[model samples]
Target: KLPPGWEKRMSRSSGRVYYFNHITNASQWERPSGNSSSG
Candidate 1:
């Protein structure tokens, strides 16, 4: 979810065209670190 007021700010300042992408690539790398080693 986006932070509070972020949509309003983006709408007003960024115009109608808005692009948002998830950091899934970075999250994939970090996911391993969060798992238990024994699991």
Candidate 2:
């Protein structure tokens, strides 16, 4: 969990927010062949 006051800074800034739901194992695979790769 984030520090209690950390969210205050995040809320004050104009940064992009990203939300993902239920990340899948297939989503972690970089290629169709299941090879690992860096994003």
Candidate 3:
């Protein structure tokens, strides 16, 4: 789980909100926070 103040920022490049992760080093933003669209 993300910490109280983890690496998460507000952004939108494709007209959708994004949540990012940093613990993985140069990772990409992830959406749905749980579900997958299979795309």
Candidate 4:
């Protein structure tokens, strides 16, 4: 499962999977290094 408020989506133009965190208002090309304990 993904982190809370984290979403996975495909970039329409690049056609690559990306991650976005709604809580942080941030986007990343790679998955965020986080664990269940931290959440």
**Tens-digit lDDT track for model 4 on 1-39?**
345798887888866788887776777765656554442
Task: Give candidate 3's whole-model lDDT.
Answer: 0.46
Please report the TM-score between candidate 4 and the true structure.
Answer: 0.48
How far is each candidate from the true structure, as Cα RMSD in Å?
Answer: 12.2, 13.1, 6.0, 5.1
Q: Against the hidden reference, what TM-scores do the models get?
A: 0.17, 0.15, 0.26, 0.48
The sequence of per-residue lDDT tens digits that candidate 3 reaches over residues 1-39 is: 343334556554545444554564432454424455453
What is the per-residue lDDT of model 2 for residues 1-39, given as tens digits with 9 covering 90 to 100? 222222212223655442222323111212222245343
How accurate locally is residue 31 in candidate 4, as Cα lDDT from 0 to 100? 64
The pairs that clash in candidate 3 are none
Per-candidate clashes come to: 0, 0, 0, 0
Q: Which stretches of candidate 4 lie over 4 Å from their true place?
A: 33-39
Q: In candidate 2, where is summed lDDT lowest over 10 consecutive residues?
A: 25-34
Q: Model 3, residue 33: what's the lDDT?
A: 45
* Residue 36 local lDDT, model 1: 60
Q: What is the C-alpha lDDT of each candidate?
A: 0.29, 0.27, 0.46, 0.70
Q: Cα miss at 23, model 1 (Å)?
A: 0.6
